[PDB]
Structure formats: C-alpha cells, structure tokens
Design a protein around this ligand. Structure first.
Ligand SMILES: O=P(O)(O)OC[C@H]1O[C@H](O)[C@H](O)[C@@H](O)[C@@H]1O
Ligand SMILES: O=P(O)(O)OC[C@H]1O[C@H](O)[C@H](O)[C@@H](O)[C@@H]1O
Lengths: 403, 403
C-alpha cells in the first residue's frame, strides 16, 4: 500500500536523523571521559565545537544545493556513512588537530543529513500531513539530545570511550546501509502514484520576506536561549536553579511548540486566502513578542517560580514553533526541484541571525544593561511582527482588489 | 576618443576604491585618539573589526550577485555614499554598540565597493590590458594602506578625530557624486564601440577548480601573513625587528607580485593552447611552494637578514600574484553578465580559506610544533600545485587528442 512505504520511510528517516543528531554531539556527550584520558584545554574544546559549527553552517547550504540535484536516498545514506566512518576514525585518534579535522568532516556530513529528509518528506507527504511529520522528524533532534547524556553515561559505565564511539560509528554504518535499503525517494520509484528556474526562486520576494522573518525569529531564539540565564542571574537576581529550570522549561515548551506548530498548521491546511500556514505563524510571533514583554517587564526579584516557568514555556511554544513553520514554508513554497535551495537559504539566514544574536547582543548588554539588550531584541521582533501583519493585511487587500 | 573615457573612468575608480580602502580601515587608523578620548576594551575593538569583517564577507558575495544585475555606476556610487554617510554618523556617535552597528553598515558598503569596479574593468578593457589595470586598481588598496597612518597622524595632529572622520565622510560623499558623474558602465553608453545561465556557471568545472585553487592560495597567504612572525620569533629564534622587517618585505614583495602578475599576464595574453594566464599562475604557485620550503628548512637562528628578506619578497611575489590572477581569471572566465557571481564565489572561497588558515593552523602549531604546521601548509600547497600541473598537462593532452 501507500501507507506502508509512508511509515517505513518515515521510520527509516527518523532513526537516521536521530543517529545524525546523536553523532552531531557525541564529542559533547563523551567530554568527561575524554578530558579524563587526555587533557584538553577549554579553548581546544570550544575550537572543536566551533569547527563543527562552521562545517555544519557551510554544509547546510551546500547540502541544500546538492540535495536539489542528487537523489536524496544516496545523499542521506552517504552522509550517515561518512558520519559513522568519521566517528570510528575519531575513536582511532588520540590528538587534538586530528580530532578537529575529523570533527570538521563530521560537521560536513551532519549538514549533509537533513535536506535529503526534507526532499523525501516533500515527495511522500501531501501538505495535509507534511507539517506535522516535519515536526515529528525534527523531534528526533530533541530525542537524541534527551537520550544523549543518559546513553552516554550508560555506555561510559559499561565501556570505554574508544569502544563507545566505535559502537556509535558501527551503528551509524549499519543504519546507513539500512537507510540505503529502506528509503525511497518518490512514489514513482515504487510504482505508486507520484503527487521553475533558480533565478525565479532568488528573485521571488516571498523567499526573501521569509528570509528576514527567519532571521528575526532565529535571532530572538538565539538571544533568549543563550542569554536568558544571564538575564535572570545578573539583573533580576533570580537563582541558578531558577535559571536552569527556566531553560529546561523553554526547551520543553519549544518541543511542544514544534509539535503543535506542525499539527495545528496541518489542521489549518486541511481546513482550508493565501497560505494557510500564516495564521498560526504570525500568531506565534505575536506570542513570542508578548512573552518577551512579560519576561522583560513583569519578572522581578520577587516574581514566583511558576510565572517564570510559564513565560519560559510560552516563549518556547512561540519560538521553536515559528522556526519549524519557517522550515515547512521554506520546503513548501519552492518547486520540488528547488526546495532544498530554499531551505538552504533559510539556513544561511540561521547563520546570519546567529551571528547578530550571539556576540553583538552581549556587547549591547554589557555596555548599556541587560534590560536594554532584551528591549532591543523585543523592539526588533515587535517591529518585524507588526510588519508581517501589515504585509499579510496588504495581501488580503490585494486579493480583494483583484476580485 | 576611447582612451579619454578609458583613463577618466580608471582614475575615477582608482580614487573611489582608494577612498573605499581608506574608509575600510579608518577606525584602525584613528584608534589612538579614539581610545584616548573614550576607553574601549580590546575585546570591543576586536569585535568592531570582526563585525566589519563579517559584513564585508557577506557583502562580497551579495555585491557580486547584485553587481551582475544592477548597473555598476550607481552601485559603486551608492556604496561609496553609504561609506561617507556611515563615517559621518560614526563621527556623530560616542558609544560602542552604535560604533559596531555603523561599522557593520560600513562593512556592507565596503563589500559593495569592488564588484562594480570589476564589471567596469571588464567592460572597458580588452584582455590585452585587463590584468595589468586590475593590478593597478587593486594597488589602490595598498596605496590607501600605505597612506593610512601618515595622513591619519597628520589629520590627528591638525584636527580632532571627530573632525577627521567628518572630513573623510564628506570627502567620500563628494567623491561618490563625482564617481556617479564620471564613471560610465560600457562604451555603448557613450557612443563608442562596445567590445549563459547561472546553472551553467555553477556546473562549470573551471570555476570550481579555480575555487579550490584560490582556497589553497589564500589559505597559504593567510597562514604566512598571520603566522610568519610567530614562526620566526618562537621556533627559529629570530628577533622582532627581523620579523617586522620580514612582514614589511612580504608586503612589498606582494605589491610587486600583484603588479608583475597583472603585467606579465597581459604580456602572455597579447603574445598568444588554452588560457594564457595559467603559465604565469602555476609558475607563481610553484614559486610559493619553493619559497615555503626554503623558509621552513633553510632559515635557522644563524640565517642572515638578507636571505630571510629575500624569502619574504619571493613569497610575496608568489602569493599576492596568484590572488590577483585568480581575481582576473574569475572576472574573465565568466560571461559579462555573470562575472560578478564568479568573483563572488571566489570571495566565498577567500572566507573559507581564511577560516581554515586562521584558527586551526594555530591549533596544529600549538599541539605539534610551528614547523609541523607550516609543513602541513606546504604539503597542502605542494599537493595542490602538483595537481594543477597534472590538470593542465592533461588538458594539453586533450587538446592534442582532439586534433
Ligand atoms: O544542531 P543545531 O545547530 O541546533 O541545528 C539543527 C537544525 O539544523 C537545520 O537547520 C535543520 O533544518 C533543522 O531541522 C535542525 O533542527
Ligand atoms: O581588506 P581585505 O580584507 O584584505 O580584502 C581586500 C580584497 O577584497 C576582495 O577580495 C577584492 O576582490 C580584492 O580586490 C581586495 O583586495
């Protein structure tokens, strides 16, 4: 049947991208035994993670451009095979520049992971279900991040870290051959019914307004995810338990935000005036701005724990939600032969927004105050969200004037 | 006549791009009076320069893509006008995040500067003269860098730094209107005789082998320019006067290398088997590898000053030379409507090679030794240069087999 290929290919991509994120952060989960066996400076550890971040930032865009042309099955399986062979070679090595070079190749293959999954989810799933299964597939990132330290502590108690990364690399090689076997690109490959130029995509204004939206939303996400603890410890005087539980509540609210963004977006798509994924997306950006206002103004030193966890969960539900919806709309607004380029340009905007949110936000916070910095982030987000409400109201006016 | 428009438009672009590089580094030349008037931390200064570097790295590629479509006169003049207005607004301001935001906009407009000059040099100059005037136009970068601290010290002795940057911004606004007036795009605009798709450019293998060549050459240039002083002070025990005079000799040899690369390349073009710019380019990469071998092995603690200045000048003649020739060939191998995209992809390779040469080279140097790091750079350069000799020998074999 059709549902058989549906659930088998989604389970194969779920296991595959789960092992991708489990090996995107394996050095981070195996850090204690690694610094116990050989001493590594903190600058070297930040350097290895930064080299993976740079390789992953390049390979987002390069893998989108290659996933438009090359078939997604072989690309996904070759990336996961390079992940497995890189982690086995990482277990063979015992020195810092070889750690960095191999982990750079891991960052390249981790970039190579996701755009094949995006292409296969576009080909197999009609847009009545594409957003919610996009959400459940990106939930494997949270699943690997949640079973990271638990399985890492179990495998470090039961095995050495050399054998731990050898088992992770061997598991990813075996699952890469199983994902070469089980995944199919399109239904026309299996006998089922299968369901523009690049200059037209680059000159399309919808892609660039989605670009600016994802820049704003990922900048606000990176600002709060990196600096909410510093905004609560230093200026507002909350305790470190409150800041850590705030960040955990923001992660849980963000998981629920991705899931409910995908599901309510597919409910709005099946129930229906333009794109049906905008009425949820702009409501979530409005919830982002309202949660930032309530977090900047109403939280004080005497504010209770329940209210600040509520604001963490409301910001999580309203920040990872628009990131998942921007991923869905970027994979959806483009033609099926140019979808990976659209999602790759949105990943380039992730890189630009992460730069504008990481280091200059700390400078604005250090020179003026932390409240002035989150006021700048709130003003940029509120001006952007009000601009999007004005834009879609103008487009409703245009669709009324053409009648 | 034709030579009138030739020399007037080249003098206008020479003055314009000279004021571009003079305002690319104006904060660096006005640093002493600025840190005297208001205290700024070293991390803040490195942050302002890094924000300019990031904006310039983005705006290389964005300005290449826009300079293919938008006319080069208005683009060049609007970039220089934004440079002038940004430096005037920088003189109005007195705080570090506004310094960073304005200097980010300066980095954007500095990226916007050069690809219009590349398009106008391609349109006005036949390839019998295009390389040498490319070299003389990129020599205005060295001219502004050489008259930077001298004119900065004179204007700081005669004026305040607020008035210094106000005069620099006013000069760039007036010269931006003069470059709107004097520059012409093509000879068909002035009544003189004027002399493919993007997917065909991206799928062209010549552009990507030029990409890997510029990655290798700019990586070796960034390695030696950033770490030759550290390779001579620490491991080989030379003095700081010898290291500083080595770096000055490398800059002078690189200036002569850009000039003689452009001139000997246009001599080889007018005297003529494929591209005539390869017989100079690969000889300069071979001279780069030979100079690195002689600098790694023959330089010792007892090596004289004259020999190490000779190796600095030979490496300079053989490193900025291939960078200028890669710029010429990137502006030349593409069609005239897609030349800025080709030079923009080569600028993206500048960014990638600068990343692979800046921070991991210090890690390879710190963990193993400095000699092992420059041995890695020499082995990558020698393997790349031998690969290019094998590739052009294979292409000579192909042009013999087609006969
Ligand atoms: O591991 P990270 O740096 O958080 O990036 C993870 C993200 O990378 C890309 O943008 C993918 O489209 C996302 O599905 C994924 O969640
Ligand atoms: O100022 P820099 O960082 O040294 O960059 C300067 C260089 O930028 C671009 O690559 C231009 O094509 C070059 O002509 C110019 O020399």
């Amino acid at each position: 049947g059709y549902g058989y290929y549906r659930t088998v290919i989604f389970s194969a991509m779920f296991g595959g991208y789960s092992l991708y994120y489990f090996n995107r952060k394996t050095f981070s989960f195996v850090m204690p035994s690694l610094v116990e066996e050989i001493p590594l400076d903190k600058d070297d550890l930040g350097f290895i993670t930064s080299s993976q971040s740079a390789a992953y930032a390049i390979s987002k865009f390069v893998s989108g451009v290659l996933s438009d042309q090359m078939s997604a099955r072989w690309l996904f399986s070759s990336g996961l095979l390079l992940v497995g062979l890189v982690n086995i070679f990482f277990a063979w090595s015992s020195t810092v520049p070889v750690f960095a070079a191999l982990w750079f190749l891991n960052g390249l293959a981790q970039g190579l992971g996701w755009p094949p999954c995006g292409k296969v989810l576009r080909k197999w799933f009609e847009p009545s279900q594409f957003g919610t299964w996009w959400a459940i597939l990106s939930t494997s990132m949270n699943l690997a991040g949640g079973l990271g330290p638990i399985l890492a502590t179990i495998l470090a108690q039961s095995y050495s870290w050399r054998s731990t990364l050898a088992l992770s690399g061997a598991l990813c090689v075996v699952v890469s051959f199983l994902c070469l076997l089980l995944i199919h690109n399109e239904p026309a490959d299996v006998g089922l019914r299968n369901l523009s130029t690049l200059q037209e995509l680059l000159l399309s204004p919808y892609l660039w307004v989605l670009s600016t939206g994802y820049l704003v939303v990922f900048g606000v996400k990176t600002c709060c995810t990196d600096w909410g603890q510093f905004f609560l410890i230093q200026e507002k005087g909350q305790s470190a338990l409150v800041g850590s539980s705030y960040m955990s509540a923001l992660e849980v609210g963000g998981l629920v935000g991705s899931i409910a963004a995908g599901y309510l977006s597919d409910r709005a798509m099946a129930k229906a005036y333009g794109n049906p994924r905008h009425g949820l997306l702009l409501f979530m950006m409005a919830g982002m701005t309202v949660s930032m206002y309530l977090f900047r103004v109403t939280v004080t030193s005497d504010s209770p724990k329940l209210w600040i966890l509520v604001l963490g969960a409301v910001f999580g539900f309203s920040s990872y939600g628009p990131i998942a919806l921007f991923g869905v709309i970027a994979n959806e607004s483009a033609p099926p032969n140019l979808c990976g380029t659209s999602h790759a340009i949105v990943g380039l905007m992730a890189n630009v927004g992460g730069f504008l949110a990481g280091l200059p936000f700390s400078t604005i916070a250090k020179h003026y105050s932390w409240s002035t910095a989150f006021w700048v982030a709130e003003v940029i987000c509120a001006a952007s969200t009000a601009a999007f409400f004005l834009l879609r109201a103008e487009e409703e006016k245009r669709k009324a004037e053409e009648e």
